[PDB]
Amino acid sequence: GLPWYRVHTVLINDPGRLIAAHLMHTALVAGWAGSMALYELATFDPSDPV
Amino acid sequence: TLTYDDIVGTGLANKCPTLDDTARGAYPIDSSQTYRIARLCLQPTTFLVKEEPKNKRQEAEFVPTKLVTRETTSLDQIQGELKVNSDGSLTFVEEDGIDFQPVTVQMAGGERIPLLFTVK
Ligand code: CLA
Ligand code: CLA
Ligand code: CLA
Ligand code: CLA
Ligand SMILES: CC1=C(/C=C/C(C)=C/C=C/C(C)=C/C=C/C=C(C)/C=C/C=C(C)/C=C/C2=C(C)CCCC2(C)C)C(C)(C)CCC1
Ligand SMILES: [Ca+2]
């Protein structure tokens, strides 16, 4: 059937699932941002800005 | 005057009495008549904790802090003699009373700083 590196072509013209996809990505990029934040807040030391 | 019930739960119990704006007079001292303090009372308003200047000694200042415990700070019922001295000065000398209360305050970092706020 499809080679591994083409599996996402299954969206080339399914505006619906293309948006479903793009939505999931945004979710992960937003998710990452949120949690990369918490990681810094759990380890950043404000004791000295100088 | 208010009864216990008239204060319970209001937090009013942790507040030293107050004098009105009027009362700005002066009390006389006989210097030949012993006097005592029937009731000293101290109510905290702020607790500042001097910060450690890190290794870089740069002079440290006191910083405000949040009161993590609650309204249990006040010292009340202090008592002792207020002897008059030869030079005409006065020195209070405490004997007994609720002269101390364990207080705990937090800081910028989140550090809890417990102290035994007292005047024993
Ligand atoms: C910016 C958006 C973007 C988008 C939407 C696409 C979309 C697509 N690309 Mg493409 N590409 C891009 C950028 C992009 N590309 C860039 C910058 C390059 C240069 C490196 C390429 C090089 C490239 C090649 C050489 C090929 C595609 C192909 C394809 C299609 C693949 C279908 C599939 O099943 O993927 C399959 C993807 C995988 C099975 C997994 C890859 C796993 C590894 C390599 C990475 C894992 C990365 C990690 C999880 C996160 C990465 C984050 C990123 C910001 C770095 C698809 C429509 C293929 C095509 O044209 O098919 C007909 C193809 O042969 N792309
Ligand atoms: C970031 C967004 C993203 C999105 C929107 C999609 C979306 C889609 N994928 Mg990909 N894919 C991705 C990333 C993504 N993929 C990555 C990084 C890989 C690794 C190479 C793949 C590998 C892959 C394959 C091999 C296939 C698809 C297929 C499909 C379609 C599947 C329909 C289905 O029934 O789901 C089922 C398939 C999936 C849900 C994708 C697998 C996702 C796995 C790899 C990771 C889940 C993450 C994990 C729980 C958290 C990580 C923790 C960390 C510590 C490791 C769909 C349109 C299939 C297809 O082409 O159908 C026609 C298919 O065969 N995907
Ligand atoms: C007429 C107004 C209009 C508006 C305002 C938008 C707005 C948007 N479109 Mg778009 N679109 C339109 C017409 C419009 N479209 C038409 C006529 C088509 C042809 C069918 C498309 C086809 C299209 C595609 C194919 C894609 C978009 C995508 C996007 C989004 C990209 C940014 C993003 O996801 O950040 C995120 C910011 C937010 C989530 C906050 C938004 C808060 C409010 C505005 C909306 C809350 C949701 C609401 C109930 C539904 C929104 C419907 C949307 C059309 C406004 C964005 C919200 C992309 C997408 O969906 O990525 C995930 C994408 O892939 N659009
Ligand atoms: C600012 C621009 C930006 C752009 C253009 C993209 C673009 C893309 N991202 Mg995204 N991403 C971004 C920001 C961005 N990202 C941010 C801020 C985050 C949070 C950290 C993510 C997290 C993210 C995830 C988790 C995934 C994507 C994926 C994808 C690809 C989806 C379509 C596809 O199938 O491509 C085809 C895929 C490729 C062409 C891969 C080539 C990637 C190149 C650029 C670098 C390869 C380097 C190396 C081998 C990667 C190391 C991997 C590590 C595990 C060892 C696409 C190329 C998905 C993906 O890569 O699916 C396969 C996916 O799973 N992104
Ligand atoms: C559902 C829901 C919810 C929740 C949510 C959550 C909880 C989320 C999370 C999320 C998350 C938690 C996310 C995360 C994400 C992440 C990411 C996205 C990542 C990424 C990564 C990467 C991409 C990596 C890579 C790499 C490496 C490894 C090395 C080299 C370099 C690089 C960078 C390439 C709520 C309640 C709101 C409500 C509604 C529903
Ligand atoms: Ca300290």
Report on the architecture of this protein.
Chain B: Its main location: membrane. The structure is cut from a larger assembly and holds chains A (50 residues) and B (120 residues). Chain A is mostly helical and 50 residues long. Chain A has one helix at residues 15-41. Chain B has no helices and eight strands. A three-stranded antiparallel beta sheet of chain B has the order 1-5-6, with no helix packed on it. In chain B, strands 4-7-8 form a three-stranded antiparallel beta sheet, with no helix packed on it. A two-stranded antiparallel ribbon of chain B has the order 2-3. Chain B starts with 35 loop residues before the first strand and ends with a strand. The chains are: A mainly alpha (50), B mainly beta (120). Chain A binds chain B through residues 46-48, 50, and chain B through 54, 56, 108-109. The complex binds chlorophyll A (CLA) (4 copies), beta-carotene and calcium ion. Residues 15, 18-19, 22-23, 26 of chain A line the site of one chlorophyll A.
Helix content of chain B: under 10%
Q: Can you list the ligands bound to this structure?
A: chlorophyll A, beta-carotene, calcium ion
Number of DSSP strand runs of chain B: 8
Taking all Cα atoms into account, the compactness measure Rg of chain B is 19 Å
What proportion of the residues of chain A is helical, as a percent range? 40-55%
Count of helical regions of chain B = 0
Protein name (chain B): Photosystem II extrinsic protein O
Family (chain B): Belongs to the PsbO family.
Subcellular location (chain B): Cellular thylakoid membrane
Organism (chain B): Thermosynechococcus vestitus (strain NIES-2133 / IAM M-273 / BP-1)
